[PDB]
Every structure is written in structure tokens, then in C-alpha cells.
Design an enzyme around this catalytic site. Structure first.
Site, short mmCIF file in Angstrom:
data_model
loop_
_atom_site.label_atom_id
_atom_site.label_comp_id
_atom_site.label_asym_id
_atom_site.label_seq_id
_atom_site.Cartn_x
_atom_site.Cartn_y
_atom_site.Cartn_z
CG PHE A 16 -6.56 84.23 115.46
CD1 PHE A 16 -5.68 85.27 115.54
CD2 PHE A 16 -6.09 83.00 115.07
CE1 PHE A 16 -4.37 85.09 115.24
CE2 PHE A 16 -4.78 82.82 114.77
CZ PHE A 16 -3.92 83.87 114.86
CE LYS A 29 -10.57 86.74 110.13
NZ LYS A 29 -9.31 86.05 110.54
CE1 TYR A 30 -13.63 84.08 111.56
CE2 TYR A 30 -13.66 85.98 112.98
CZ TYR A 30 -13.07 84.82 112.56
OH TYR A 30 -11.90 84.38 113.11
CD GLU A 65 -6.96 72.79 113.60
OE1 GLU A 65 -7.49 73.49 112.72
OE2 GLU A 65 -5.73 72.79 113.82
CG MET A 91 -5.75 70.48 105.24
SD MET A 91 -5.40 72.05 104.46
CE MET A 91 -5.69 73.10 105.85
CD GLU A 97 -10.76 81.86 109.60
OE1 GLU A 97 -10.50 80.91 110.37
OE2 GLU A 97 -11.50 82.81 109.92
CD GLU A 132 -0.42 82.27 109.11
OE1 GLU A 132 -1.43 81.59 108.88
OE2 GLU A 132 -0.40 83.19 109.95
#
Ligand SMILES: *c1cnn(CC(=O)Nc2ccc(C)c(S(=O)(=O)NCCc3ccccn3)c2)c(=O)c1Cl
Lengths: 297, 294, 318, 318
Positions: C8, C14-15, C73, C101, C116, C125
Site C-alpha cells: 500500500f 496518492k500521498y 487504528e 471509530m 483512506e 470497503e
């Protein structure tokens, strides 16, 4: 050549240690993933909320090094078949934790002990894990109770088949799984012979050799007895990996000498005939019989 | 001396003149190693700047003992027994020897009455006896069938000690004899001789129960980790556990004091020789807590 | 696994884009005169091993402002890595949280949130569910990154893929289940029959009492050749902040951005089409308290069966 | 369905017992001098079509006290029946609630709670979970009915049943799954090999911060004949209030109480036993946030496999 590894329980710095290991000529290292004296609490406070980190990181090595050079080990304080409910529950939780960190690292195998008769709940926990890497079960030829010295006056010393029954019942509970295999520990005195034949047929992937069975030569090199040599010869056919455990008692001689003795033993063997040669690559490979009447070849 | 101290504190021992010895190890993160520390002023601990001497070990500290006045014996993760001595002015710490004789972790160590020998036990099931002047092993005894948890020497005889294991046995030893060991529910965890009497001792169990040797009492919830006697002419008994608590008992196994000061496992207790009313404790939360006891 | 996270983290496009978007948001939120008083609270939700966290620090430096980071996380093995990197480097700026979350009780409110949680078909997802479970500890003038995302669908023909599906049969289940579930696949030997059209769209934050992430769409595709129909391919485009965007759409693909491959939805029986005809297709996005799934069907030029009722073959577990 | 409820409501022994227990509880809770001031708040949780509600009213009359009833039912079709019977008869005494125990915000506190969440093996319909999710709107001097229940296990031999299991095979699943799941069955042609012994036990209310409904048990059964082992049969006993009890145990069965049949747990391979030997067996009760299940295994005289790991064949959905 033959493959061998080093068993350790003290790894202060992982990189230096693995370097030295590979230097003496070892192919893999077996080591703990957590610290062995670091008991975790999961249920009860205030220790449940101990601050992290709980272990060292994955970024210390490389993916392929993890994948090829490291076998995992379960911490000794973990006892799922205890009689104290609290300990048993904490042990369940810790066991799953360590197994899942192993999975996260992509390890090729993981060492687990059998040192007693009742390992029903252990088998349950592992069986759960599997239906959600190989697993090497550490089982000795002689039980440690049948191994102690006669130096207790009011508890004297005196059955060769109990340690095999342990393994058999375990594997039966787990349902003859492919990912479960034997790691046979060897000691000074050896059992009979029909026994050693009994461990034929079993999925033996590794053999564990302590430093304390190597005698010392007149020059000061390490050697073995002849019955040990016979057993080694028999194991070399099955093509197992050997592991050295314990301390260097011959502080004059580095571990490289043990390995060279092993290679010497391997080289001087009755070489393979024409059959055994032709029979290379087919060991335990199932085939359908030919039918030269109904079919055409 | 080292810059930072390890977060896990395992051992704490007062000496005669009042100075304090500390032992630490790292159990998580990048490097798993150890360190030793001397504090003449014990109320200034655990601050690495106000120490009097300190040193860094190769590996972790599991136990340690004073050897009289200058000496420090250490049980190690390496499988070694280690002797250090202090410098003349107590400014440094230096190694005398480091013998690798155990094939696994050294869990416990104890010095013997005379002050010249010592006994060590390991997770490899072997017990050994050392002569500290010659740097040799006099004896290796393999009597137990599993890991050894605690050995304890008798304060009145230089040939008698005790030993406990995870195989559920408690042995009495006398090396004068040809068969040295002799035998005497839940698993045993901790031992301690009675100072005055020469036939009495206490032992703690896996479940939470203390016992005098019979007499018994349920003191904690989890495993009893240690037992220490007060230096009183009639002594009190301190009990520390895995439930993160401490307790002080009288001569009847009746409870007199209890503390919840710590936020993690309590590891050791030591009575001060100056004031017999004071008691110090350490733990894995990095606290040094001082207790004034009635 | 750690390898997955490693793969990943290897796409820098992307970053860089995330970094730029954060930079811009902060320049626009904090004037040039209170640089040294107004501290902005950021949150990385789904922090993994922490490349977003570092991108955020880089961006705040770039902008020369001040932030305060929380990382959440729910995987403990990755939390290990995070806590190590924190102790060794990040410091007090960063607070690590091991939680979901949807269950975490936040201490304070955030200005910006960053995620992400995007797959090949955008929503597959479960980003909407999670960010909706998180929007309450975002304040009123709060910003989400991403703020918008959209999915796309197009028809294809390919014997090779149909036969590779045929082969995904396995014992102890329905012998047609492999046709009722999607796949991620780098498409190569295939023919596309008509341009892609938009399917479902989501935007965050959702300031509506009626939060319904369930959806129904209908689409019509013109054809200009005789052929066969074997499935539908999927794509997506996202808006991070205003003009910063990411796409795997073959017409607007982002250069050198190889994180995502396309997604393939199949059908059981091939359908013959003729020039001038028109393929129509229906898609549903469905839900319960436990699961999310999709259902699709062809209506024109000929009708098919409804694929994957009640999630009997594919479910996305909450 | 309505038929199920109809069959349930036809056994009067159980409802007479419930009535008696309520009567006794109320006589013991409210003195004979405040008859006309102290109103007790009752709650029927799992009210179905309302025979417990009527039994409760009957009992309060019998005792000549005063109550106030709340009824909670999460099935709307049964709520229809309840609301009709309420409008026509019960009146203001009774308040109907359409909700789950575990999500309802109660107005006030209750003195007594009453439930019928018992299956053949006591706990296999999830009474502990539910009543634990309900115990917070019970007050300190509160009473649960039932307060206690216990399950039992015994070994058996029977070719007929083993062959009926053999026959429960079905396509699209593991060909040994039918041996990894229990059954409710009126046992007839069979042989019992040893008395029943107690397995798991629950008691309400649970006044402990460590609520764990997970369990592990081991049992040893002596044998006195040569034979085969084919499975284990299950029973249960309950204590409603003090001396009022219900049992399907064959030694203490309640007369004319035919609501419940026994439950059968099977094994895959039969095990041969000899006189004097001893069968040992292990049972687990396991859990996650989504599901509950059981696992069992034989250790002596010969070992078996572990049956139903991770609930791969039988799950009780929350
Ligand atoms: C490390 C690595 N290798 N060596 C050389 C070594 O291993 N030498 C050795 C091993 C074992 C024996 C029994 C002997 S011996 O001289 O006693 N007998 C000869 C057998 C033999 C073994 C290997 C090759 C050839 N011949 C010598 C080291 O010394 C270290 Cl430190």
C-alpha cells in the site's frame, strides 16, 4: 547440505544476534516474539491498561528475512490447561495474541510445547485459530519425571510409550491436520527400538539436539556415541532439520564445529543405489494405476 | 552512568548502612537489556541524575542479592550468574566474573549463611551451588521435574536451603547428606524462612493463599510473588502480589495494612534498617513508593 | 498482514496529493496573522502504519502552521508499529488510540478528518458507514478529506474472463455462486462496449437526519456492434479537497497511480447483442445491521435473473 | 408464526406455576398493611401473545394487591394481537412496548421481571444475554423470575438415531455437518448408559462487574455394560421462586408438562465401550459480539475430534 538452526531465549538486539547466527553457519533462528517474562493482563484492572508498546516492531527486519529465517516461540508462562480459571482465561487470550502477531509477520513456523498429558484446551484454541504457517509441536522421547535423579529419600524412582500417546491424542483432537507437525527432543539415554520405529510414520519436521549429549574427543572436539549416530542416520533419510539448543560447554570450540561434525556424518553414508536414485522425487506421491486394456498408452 | 533508566523495575534491596540497591530491565521495544543502580539517598529515586553509582548489563535482570557489603550477585536472562563489585569510593561498578552454566533463564538466586557460597535455579530445571571465591560450580542437582520458581537459604545453617517448582513439590536440602533433598493443592510461588526460629517458614500459592509451616490465610486475589519479614524483634510479614496490592501481616496471619498505590505488578519489598517502621516497594509502573507502617 | 501495508505504502502519487490537499485546507482555515495561537486538531482515522500521519506533519511544516494529531487504528499489530514510531520520533504531537471509530469517546473536537477507506468501487470497503459513525466528534465548520467520491460502470465482453470465472467453482456451495460475486482484476484481453456512466455517489459530512446509504440506479448503454455481453467493469473518482482529485477511470486516470485495479461484476449467462440495441442494467445497494451487499440485473435487450439476493454469495461484514 | 404460539399456550402446568410464584413473591414483598398504597411495577419481557400477562393479573387478584404492567415484544405481528387485547380488555393497567429488551429506554424502575426464554437445554435460546442487557432498569431489591436454571447431560446408544442423523445430509455443505449440530427429539428407542450430571448454571440478577457467560465443563460417567456410544442427551431444571420449580429431567419430571422435549448432541464416529470403563466429555460455551455456540469432545476411553469449531455448522444468532 543439511540444514540446521539455533534455539535461543535471550535476544537483546535482533540484528546483531541474527548476524552472528548466520556467521557460525546456521540457517535459521528460533526466538520469542514477545518477551518471555512479560506477563500480560487482559481482564482485570489496573494492569489491563498497561501502556504500550507491548513488543518490538516489524520494521526491524525485512519481509523476506521474517519469512525465511525466523521460527516463532510461545512464552513459557502461558498455560491453558491450568486448574485456576483466571490463569486459564488469560492464557487463552495471550496465546491467540501471540499467534496472530506471528501471522501478521508471515512466519514460516511456530514452536509449541507438549510437556504433560492434558492439552485439550490448547488444541481447542489452536484449532479455532486455524479455521480463521506450520506449527511445530515440541515433544520429548522421555518424560521429565522419568528423567530426574534419585536424590529424594521419601519419593523414590522407578511407560516408554506415554509421550507418543500425548501427541496422538492431540492430533486426533485437531483432526489430523496438515499444518501440525512434530519437533522431537532428544536426550542422553534412549528408549528401545520398536519405539524408535513407532515414531516412523509420524510427520517429523525437526529434531532438537542439546549440547550436553556431545562427548569431547581427545583433541577436544565434540562427538557422539554410536547409538546416537545410528539414530541420526535414520533421521537424515526423512530429511529433517536439526536444531541446537543450550550453552557451549566447550568454550574453546565455536558452534561451527558441531555443524562440521554433522556434515561429516552426512557425507560418510552408504550412498544411494540405482533405485533410491531413480526413486528421487516420488517419495509418498500417490499415483493412479495404469490400465493398458481399456486405455492406450 | 547510563542516560535513561529501564521502565520495568524488578529488585530493591537495602544494605546495613541504609543505602539502596535497584534493578531494572527492558521488556518491550527495540532493546531488551538491563541496568543496576545504587542510591545512598533512597527518597531521590528513581532519578538517574541523583544516583551514586550505576551500570548497564548485557541482558535482563531477574533477581539479585547483596554479598555482604561490596558485592552484587545477579541472575540473568542469558543463563549466567554474574558477580560485580563496587569501587573503593563507591563511584563505579565493575564485573568480577560471568559464568554461563545454565541452559536457560536464571530465575532465582540466594546466598548462604557463611557468605561464601550460593545457590541458583533456572527454567532448565537444574539447581547449582557456587563457591564465590574460586568461581566454580561445586554441584548440579536435577531433582525437580519442571521449572524452579524460588530457592531460599536458611539464615542459621550453611548447608540448608529450600526449593519450590511448578511440579508442585517443596524440597528441603542438606548437602551434608548423600540424598540431600526431602519432601514436605495449588502451585507454590514464594518462600521465606522465619528469622528467629530455625524450623519454620512461609510459602505462598498460585491462588492467593499464604500459609505458615498448619496455618493459612487468603490475602490476595492473584499470585503471591514475594514474602519478606520485618527486622523487628518480633517480626511482621510483608506480602506482595500480582493483583497490584501490598499487605503487612502479623504473627497470626491477620491483616494490619493494605496499599493500592501501584498501577501494575509489585515486584519487591525491603525494610529499612534505620527506621523499622518504614517499607519500600517497586514495580513495573516505574514507581518507588515509601510506606510508613504502624 | 505487514506485506499488504508495505505494498500500500509504495505509491507516492496518492500521498503527495493528500499532502497538497491538507496544505491547502490549512492555509485556507487559519489566517496568516494568528499563525502562533490557533492550533488545529487533526485526526487520522484508519492510520495503519502511519504514512498519512507523516504526510500531515510534512504538510503542516510546508504551510508553517500548528496542528495536533490523533491516530485511531483497531488492529493491534499495527498499533505496535505505531507506538514504536511514536516513542522514537513523533513525540507528544501525536496521540495513538487503539479503538474503532464507531466506539471511541473522543476527548475534544476536530477541525479536519482524513481517511483512506477507499477500494476499487469506492464504497465497497464501507467508508460511508464508518465516517457516519464518526461525524459527531467533528465540529460544525469541520472538513472531511475525502469529501466526495463517485463510482462508474461500463460493459465488456471477454471469453477469457468468463472461463476464469467458470473455473472458480469449489465444493460445498452453490455451483453458480462464483457468478454472484465481484473480483478485482487487471483487465487486459477484453472488449469494452460503451463508455462508463456514473452509478453511486457519496459526500461527507452528511448533514441530514435521514441517513440512508442504500441506493438504486438504472443505466442505459448504446451499442454499435454485434457481440456478446459478459459483465460490467467498475471504476471511481474522488475529490480530496476542491481541485485535488484521484481517478482510475481509463479516460482520466491519474499518472503513475497503481494502487488500485478495476473491479469486475459478472453475469451467469452471456447475452447476445446487436448493433443499435441498448443494454439496460439495474444495481442496488442494500443493508442490514450486520451486512452490506450489492444486487444487479440486466433488463434490456433481454432480461436476466437478479444476482445475489440477500447476500447469499457475497457479503461485506460490518 | 401464530400456530407456534398456539402450541406454546396449551400447557397449563407451567402457567399455574408461574402464577403461584408471582403470588408468593408479591405476598412476601408488600405487607398486609400498605395494601392500598404500594403499587408494584412488573415487566413481562418476551410477552408474545400474552398468557404471562393474564397469569400475572390473576395472581395479583389472588393475592389482593396492586400492580402495574409493562409488556415488551420485538415481533410486530404479535404486537398486533397484544394491542387488540389491550384495547378490548386489559385497559390502562397494561402498557405495550414494541422494542428489544436491549435497546429500550425505560420510563421508571421495576420491582419484578418475568421471562419465558427457556429452551430444551436451558440457555440455548439466549436468556442470559437478554436478561443481562435488561438488568439495569431493575432496581436493587429487584427480583427475577426465573432466578436460576441448570442443564444436564447423559450418554446414550441408538442405531436408529445415528441413522436418522446419517440421513440429514444435504447438498451444498460439508458432508459431516449434520453430526456437528443438535436436535430436539422425543427419545424412544434408545439406551441410556449412565445417570445425568450437571453441566452449566445461570442465576439472575448477576451482580458482578465481570459478566462472562462463557463456560467450560468436564464430566466423567461410569459404565457397567459393554456397548456403543452414539451421543449425549440433555435436560434442565429451573427454580422460579424458592420452592416453585420445573424439570424435564426423567427422574424429577413435572407431571403433565409437555412443552419441552429433550435435546440430542451427536458425535461423528461411534465409540466402543466396555464394562468398568469411564466416558469423559468436555463442553464449551463460546461467544463473540455476533454469535453464541457450543463445542464438545470425548477424551476417554478413546479420544474424538472437537465438534463444531468456530460455529462452522451451528450458530445462535444474536
Ligand atoms: C568451526 C568449524 N569447523 N571447525 C573444524 C571442525 O569442525 N573440525 C572437527 C570437527 C569434528 C571432529 C570430530 C574433528 S576431529 O579432528 O576430532 N576428527 C575429524 C573429523 C572431521 C570433521 C570434519 C571435517 C573433517 N574431519 C574435527 C572448527 O574447528 C570450528 Cl571452531
Amino acid at each position: 547440505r543439511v540444514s540446521s538452526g539455533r534455539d535461543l531465549n535471550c535476544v537483546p538486539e535482533i540484528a546483531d544476534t541474527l548476524g552472528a547466527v548466520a556467521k557460525q553457519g546456521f540457517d535459521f533462528l528460533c526466538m520469542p516474539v514477545f518477551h518471555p517474562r512479560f506477563k500480560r493482563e487482559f481482564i482485570q484492572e489496573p494492569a489491563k491498561n498497561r501502556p504500550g508498546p507491548q513488543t518490538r516492531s516489524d520494521l526491524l527486519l525485512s519481509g523476506r528475512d521474517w519469512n525465511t529465517l525466523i521460527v516463532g516461540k510461545l512464552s513459557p508462562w502461558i498455560r491453558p490447561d491450568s486448574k485456576v480459571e483466571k490463569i486459564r482465561r488469560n492464557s487463552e487470550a495471550a496465546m491467540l495474541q501471540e499467534l496472530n502477531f506471528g501471522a501478521y509477520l508471515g512466519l514460516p513456523a511456530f514452536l509449541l510445547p507438549l510437556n504433560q498429558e492434558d492439552n485439550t484446551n490448547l488444541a481447542r484454541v489452536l484449532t479455532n485459530h486455524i479455521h480463521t504457517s506450520m506449527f511445530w509441536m515440541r515433544v520429548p522421547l522421555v518424560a521429565p519425571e522419568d528423567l530426574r535423579d534419585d536424590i529424594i529419600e521419601n519419593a523414590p524412582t522407578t511407560g516408554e510409550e506415554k509421550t507418543w500417546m500425548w501427541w496422538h491424542n492431540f492430533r486426533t483432537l485437531c483432526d489430523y491436520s496438515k499444518r501440525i507437525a512434530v519437533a522431537l527432543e532428544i536426550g542422553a539415554d534412549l528408549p528401545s527400538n520398536h519405539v524408535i520405529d513407532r515414531w516412523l510414520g509420524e510427520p517429523i519436521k525437526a529434531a532438537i539436539l542439546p549440547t550436553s549429549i556431545f562427548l569431547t574427543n581427545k583433541k577436544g572436539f565434540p562427538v557422539l556415541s554410536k547409538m546416537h549416530q545410528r539414530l541420526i542416520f535414520r533421521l537424515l533419510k526423512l530429511e529433517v532439520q536439526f536444531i541446537i539448543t543450550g550453552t557451549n560447554h566447550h568454550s574453546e570450540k565455536e558452534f561451527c564445529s558441531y555443524l562440521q561434525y554433522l556434515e561429516y556424518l552426512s557425507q560418510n553414508r552408504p550412498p544411494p543405489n540405482a533405485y533410491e536414485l531413480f526413486a528421487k522425487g516420488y517419495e509418498d506421491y500417490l499415483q493412479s494405476p495404469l490400465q493398458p486394456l481399456m486405455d492406450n498408452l | 552512568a547510563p542516560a535513561c533508566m529501564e521502565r520495568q523495575l524488578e529488585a530493591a534491596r537495602y544494605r546495613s548502612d541504609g543505602a539502596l540497591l535497584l534493578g531494572a530491565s527492558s521488556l518491550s521495544g527495540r532493546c531488551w537489556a538491563g541496568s543496576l543502580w545504587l542510591f545512598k539517598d533512597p527518597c531521590a529515586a528513581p532519578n538517574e541524575g541523583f544516583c551514586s553509582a550505576g551500570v548497564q548489563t548485557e541482558a535482563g535482570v531477574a533477581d539479585l542479592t547483596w554479598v555482604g557489603e561490596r558485592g552484587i550477585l545477579v541472575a540473568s536472562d542469558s543463563g549466567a550468574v554474574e558477580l560485580w563489585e563496587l569501587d573503593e569510593n563507591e563511584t563505579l561498578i565493575v564485573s568480577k566474573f560471568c559464568k554461563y552454566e545454565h541452559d536457560d533463564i536464571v530465575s532465582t538466586v540466594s546466598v548462604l549463611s557463611s557468605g561464601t557460597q550460593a545457590v541458583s535455579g533456572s527454567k532448565d530445571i537444574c539447581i547449582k551451588v557456587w563457591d564465590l571465591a574460586q568461581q566454580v560450580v561445586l554441584s548440579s542437582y536435577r531433582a525437580h521435574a519442571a521449572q524452579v520458581t524460588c530457592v531460599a537459604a536458611s539464615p542459621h545453617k550453611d548447608s540448608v536451603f529450600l526449593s519450590c517448582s511448578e511440579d508442585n513439590r517443596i524440597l528441603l536440602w542438606d548437602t551434608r547428606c548423600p540424598k540431600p533433598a526431602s519432601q514436605i493443592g495449588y502451585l507454590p510461588t514464594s518462600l521465606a524462612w522465619h528469622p528467629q526460629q530455625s524450623e519454620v517458614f512461609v510459602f505462598g500459592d498460585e491462588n492467593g493463599t499464604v500459609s505458615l509451616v498448619v496455618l493459612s490465610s487468603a490475602v490476595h486475589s492473584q499470585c503471591v510473588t514475594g514474602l519478606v519479614f520485618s527486622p523487628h524483634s518480633v517480626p511482621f510479614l510483608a506480602s506482595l502480589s500480582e493483583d497490584c496490592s501490598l499487605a503487612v501481616l502479623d504473627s497470626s496471619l491477620s491483616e494490619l495494612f493494605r496499599s493500592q498505590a501501584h498501577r501494575d505488578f509489585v515486584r519487591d519489598a525491603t525494610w529499612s534498617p534505620l527506621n523499622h517502621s518504614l517499607l519500600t516497594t517497586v514495580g513495573w509502573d516505574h514507581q518507588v513508593v515509601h510506606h510508613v507502617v504502624p | 498482514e505487514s506485506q499488504t501495508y508495505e505494498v500500500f505504502e509504495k505509491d507516492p502519487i496518492k500521498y503527495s496529493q493528500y499532502q497538497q490537499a491538507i496544505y491547502k485546507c490549512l492555509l485556507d482555515r487559519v489566517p496568516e496573522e494568528e499563525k502562533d495561537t490557533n492550533v488545529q486538531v487533526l485526526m487520522v482515522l484508519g492510520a495503519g502504519r502511519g504514512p498519512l500521519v507523516n504526510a500531515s506533519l510534512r504538510a503542516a511544516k510546508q504551510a508553517d502552521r500548528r496542528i495536533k494529531l490523533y491516530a485511531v487504528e483497531k488492529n493491534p499489530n499495527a498499533v505496535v508499529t505505531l507506538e514504536n514510531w511514536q516513542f522514537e520520533e513523533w513525540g507528544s504531537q501525536v496521540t495513538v488510540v487503539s479503538s474503532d471509530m464507531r466506539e471511541w469517546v473522543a476527548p475534544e473536537k476536530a477541525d479536519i478528518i482524513v481517511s483512506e477507506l477507499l477500494g476499487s468501487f469506492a464504497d465497497n470497503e464501507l467508508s460511508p458507514e464508518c465516517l457516519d459513525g464518526a461525524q459527531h466528534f467533528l465540529k460544525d465548520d469541520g472538513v472531511s478529506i475525502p469529501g466526495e467520491y463517485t463510482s462508474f460502470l461500463a460493459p465488456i465482453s471477454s471469453s477469457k474472463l468468463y472461463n476464469e470465472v467458470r473455473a472458480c467453482r469449489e465444493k460445498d456451495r452453490d455451483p453458480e455462486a462464483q457468478f454472484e460475486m465481484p473480483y478485482v482484476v487487471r483487465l487486459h484481453n477484453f472488449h469494452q462496449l460503451s463508455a462508463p456512466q456514473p452509478c453511486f455517489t457519496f459526500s461527507h459530512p452528511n448533514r441530514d437526519p435521514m441517513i440512508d446509504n442504500n441506493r438504486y440506479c438504472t443505466l442505459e448503454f448504446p451499442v454499435e456492434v454485434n457481440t456478446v455481453l459478459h459483465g460490467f467493469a467498475g471504476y471511481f473518482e474522488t475529490v480530496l479537497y476542491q481541485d485535488i482529485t484521484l481517478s482510475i477511470r481509463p479516460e482520466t486516470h491519474s499518472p503513475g497511480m497503481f494502487s488500485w485495479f478495476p473491479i469486475l461484476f459478472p453475469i451467469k449467462q452471456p447475452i447476445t447483442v446487436r448493433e443499435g440495441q441498448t443494454i439496460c442494467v439495474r444495481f442496488w445497494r442494500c443493508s442490514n445491521s450486520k451486512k452490506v451487499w450489492y444486487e444487479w440485473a440486466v433488463t434490456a435487450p433481454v432480461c436476466s435473473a437478479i444476482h445475489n439476493p440477500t447476500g447469499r454469495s457475497y457479503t461485506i461484514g460490518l
